[PDB]
Amino acid sequence: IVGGYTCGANTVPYQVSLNSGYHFCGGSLINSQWVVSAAHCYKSGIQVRLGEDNINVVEGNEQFISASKSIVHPSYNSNTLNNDIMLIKLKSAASLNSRVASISLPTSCASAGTQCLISGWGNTKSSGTSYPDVLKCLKAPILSDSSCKSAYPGQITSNMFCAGYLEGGKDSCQGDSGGPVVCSGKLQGIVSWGSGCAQKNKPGVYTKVCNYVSWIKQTIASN
Ligand SMILES: NCc1cccc(-n2cccc2)c1
Numbered sequence: 001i002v003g004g005y006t007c008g009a010n011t012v013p014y015q016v017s018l019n020s021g022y023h024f025c026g027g028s029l030i031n032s033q034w035v036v037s038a039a040h041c042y043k044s045g046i047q048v049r050l051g052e053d054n055i056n057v058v059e060g061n062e063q064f065i066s067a068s069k070s071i072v073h074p075s076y077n078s079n080t081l082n083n084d085i086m087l088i089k090l091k092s093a094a095s096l097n098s099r100v101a102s103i104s105l106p107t108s109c110a111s112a113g114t115q116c117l118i119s120g121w122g123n124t125k126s127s128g129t130s131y132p133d134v135l136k137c138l139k140a141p142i143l144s145d146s147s148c149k150s151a152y153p154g155q156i157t158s159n160m161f162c163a164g165y166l167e168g169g170k171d172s173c174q175g176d177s178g179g180p181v182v183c184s185g186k187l188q189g190i191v192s193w194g195s196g197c198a199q200k201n202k203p204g205v206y207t208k209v210c211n212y213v214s215w216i217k218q219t220i221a222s223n
């Protein structure tokens with residue numbers, strides 16, 4: 001997160017860190033056994049880390065649970081990043097509490113102008129490289145489809161939306177991938193892609209979660 005703020009420990013209780021020897025992506029806990037992330041975060045040997053603030057220090061509220069299965073969306077295209085969504089099942093159910101909690105799926109899509117919270121342990125620099133230990137947060141509005149398409153000609157599908165600031169300075173970044181965009185207490189987006197970070201006229205692009213609720217529910221119901 002570039003141009004954000006320190007969230008505060010366990011203030012984003014649905015935020016997970018995906019770890020394969022090191023943090024590599026964010027995710028969102030959607031029930032005791034399931035995490036939603038980006039398809040471009042797919043790899044084998046994933047441990048889901050819940051209740052994290054400082055990802056380099058065991059602070060006492062963590063739960064570390066290995067993935068038993070990952071399910072990349074059947075229509076994910078890694079070239080265009082269309083359908084950039086994946087489900088991860090935990091080997092055992094997380095113990096839910098005030099600091100480890102699921103986030104609700106949307107019942108409808110959120111409109112341009114809606115204020116959202118984007119979070120993660122990604123790069124905090126727009127030019128350089130600096131990775132934080134503690135969770136960073138950014139309040140950002142959803143941008144109009146037209147402005148999103150104008151920013152990225154030929155690249156925005158119906159499964160994507162832009163959020164952030166066309167002036168730059170405030171954005172998600174490398175390592176925030178797969179993490180949450182939460183608006184009005186619903187998971188509306190997944191950190192997906194962009195062109196660099198916090199650059200003028202290059203806002204963050206996010207997987208449009210409301211398009212996938214049926215797939216998520218049915219997949220969970222049979223797996
Ligand atoms: N600024 C949007 C964004 C989201 C997720 C990742 C990246 N990124 C990947 C490499 C460099 C930036 C950007």
Ligand SMILES: [Ca+2]
Pocket residue numbers: 052053054055056057058059062
């Ligand atoms: Ca920790």
